[PDB]
Amino acid sequence: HMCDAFVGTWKLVSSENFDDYMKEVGVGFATRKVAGMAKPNMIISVNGDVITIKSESTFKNTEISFILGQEFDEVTADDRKVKSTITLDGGVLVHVQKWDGKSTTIKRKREDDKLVVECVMKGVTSTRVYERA
Ligand SMILES: O=c1cc(CSCc2ccc(Cl)cc2)[nH]c(=S)[nH]1
């Protein structure tokens, strides 16, 4: 029942500062423009200890499956090949991605009826708000 309140199908409804986050990560111009337009659905499910997070959009469909605390290699939507570890910290899913000596952290939390995604790269934060689909 760890992640019960995350399970379901969620649709992006707002984004702030995502272009600056993508710049800080190193995403190139064309990918930033097309990725910034996307209105993904995020589909979260749990089966035993395995959590699956799917993102589906007109830009790029992604899927990760993982066990909390157990590192996994991930190909991001912008085509980085990263090493990821996701943990639960005080009810927040904390997702750290490492690549090329760099690191970014994505936090996913339930706030009221929303799922709030905070993406941080150094000093730059983007907030993406999802509602139930
Ligand atoms: O599941 C998720 C994860 C995130 C983390 S940044 C992903 C991402 C990265 C690069 C590009 Cl070009 C587009 C997208 N943001 C939302 S909204 N949902």
From Swiss-Prot:
Q: Please tell me where a fatty acid binds in this chain.
A: R128, V129, Y130
InterPro entries documented for this protein: Calycin, Fatty_acid-bd, ILBP, Lipocln_cytosolic_FA-bd_dom
Which gene is the coding source of this polypeptide chain?
Answer: FABP4
Function noted in UniProt: Lipid transport protein in adipocytes. Binds both long chain fatty acids and retinoic acid. Delivers long-chain fatty acids and retinoic acid to their cognate receptors in the nucleus.
What effect on the protein does mutating E24D have, as reported in its record? In a breast cancer sample; somatic mutation
Q: Anything noted about its domains?
A: Forms a beta-barrel structure that accommodates hydrophobic ligands in its interior.
Which residues are modified to N-acetylcysteine? C3
The Phosphotyrosine modification is found at Y21
Q: What GO cellular component entries does it have? A: cytoplasm; cytosol; extracellular exosome; lipid droplet; nucleus
> What Gene Ontology terms describe what this protein does at the molecular function level?
fatty acid binding; hormone receptor binding; long-chain fatty acid binding; long-chain fatty acid transmembrane transporter activity
Q: Record's PANTHER family?
A: FATTY ACID BINDING PROTEIN
Question: What lineage is on file?
Answer: Eukaryota, Metazoa, Chordata, Craniata, Vertebrata
| Domain of life (superkingdom) | Eukaryota
As stated in the Swiss-Prot or TrEMBL entry, residues carrying the post-translational modification Phosphoserine are S14
* Keywords of this entry: Acetylation, Cytoplasm, Lipid-binding, Nucleus, Phosphoprotein, Transport
Instruction: Report the protein name in the record.
Output: Fatty acid-binding protein, adipocyte
Locate the motif Nuclear localization signal.
23-33
Give the quaternary structure: Monomer. Homodimer. Interacts with PPARG.
**One matching Pfam family, short form?**
Lipocalin
Question: What protein family does this chain belong to?
Answer: Belongs to the calycin superfamily. Fatty-acid binding protein (FABP) family.
Q: In which compartments does the protein localize?
A: Cytoplasm; Nucleus
Which biological process terms from the Gene Ontology are attached to this UniProt entry? brown fat cell differentiation; cellular response to lithium ion; cellular response to tumor necrosis factor; cholesterol homeostasis; fatty acid transport; long-chain fatty acid transport; negative regulation of DNA-templated transcription; positive regulation of cold-induced thermogenesis
